[PDB]
Design a protein around this ligand. Sequence first.
Ligand code: IO4
Ligand code: MG
Ligand code: ZN
Length: 313
Amino acid sequence: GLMQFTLPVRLCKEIELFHFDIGPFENMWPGIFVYMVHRSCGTSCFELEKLCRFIMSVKKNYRRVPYHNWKHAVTVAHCMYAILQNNHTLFTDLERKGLLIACLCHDLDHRGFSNSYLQKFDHPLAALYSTSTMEQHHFSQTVSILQLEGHNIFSTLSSSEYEQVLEIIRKAIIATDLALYFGNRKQLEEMYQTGSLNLNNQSHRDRVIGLMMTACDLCSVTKLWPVTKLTANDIYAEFWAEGDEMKKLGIQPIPMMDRDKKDEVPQGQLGFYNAVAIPCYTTLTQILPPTEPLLKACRDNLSQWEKVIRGEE
Ligand SMILES: O=C(Nc1ccnc(Cl)c1)c1ccc2cc(-c3ccccc3)nn2c1
Ligand SMILES: [Mg+2]
Ligand SMILES: [Zn+2]
């Protein structure tokens, strides 16, 4: 009850900033997450023993893949922490509880393969979940872990509050399917510009939480350049392995996943910043002005990729 988590001075200060990197010491990431739950939600939100047991079972159910790993889970949770702390009064008690957990769990048991590869492989999961295949699995794994003995961090919630938080988590995790992002952002852009956006409309809140989830999930593009550049290596390490597996199924992969086309990576990053990242943080900044630093950092990284193409690095 009177047991706060406290980080070293540099981490205590920089964890508040959007571009914070959680560092290479894996053993500190549980502590960093609990610290973030305590400050963004409260020391009362969760039973500490149950939370710690929940966190360590979530960690165990992330795989040793180059990018879609435990470090990604905690990184995405930190971006959500920064959004919530910069938007104090906008979010309900249940939303602050659910969204940090949603981010920690959003890629549970990821194999480093796209929905697309599962469909072409004819993976069992593609027959169980026809759309948003991996994201329905991530939600299923979250519910599984919540139902383990001593792992029910929501035990103090009423039956209707429990159903509400699990619905926040389900929608937040489904929203991380980038295929759904494009339509969600277009709808949010129209609602904001025609002035019909209403944060008391539950279907509108759902859309806004969806965009927050895309923003947190893509947040590697909002780090300082050296973090962004090195994270790109891990992202493409997965993409190229999927491309290899596409070639094993006798299917030429998209260039993004073809290691023979490494040379086109800089131009591929430009397309991604212009088609996905910048539009994402732009719309997020219009709806939630204090998230502007994410847009600024994204624009800084776009400029760095433009420099790579011009041979200035
Ligand atoms: O980074 C990307 N997607 C992503 C998804 C989820 N999360 C994160 Cl953080 C990032 C991304 C998107 C499109 C694209 C095209 C090419 C590309 C094109 C031609 C040649 C070589 C490569 N690379 N490439 C990378
Ligand atoms: Mg995912
Ligand atoms: Zn993710």
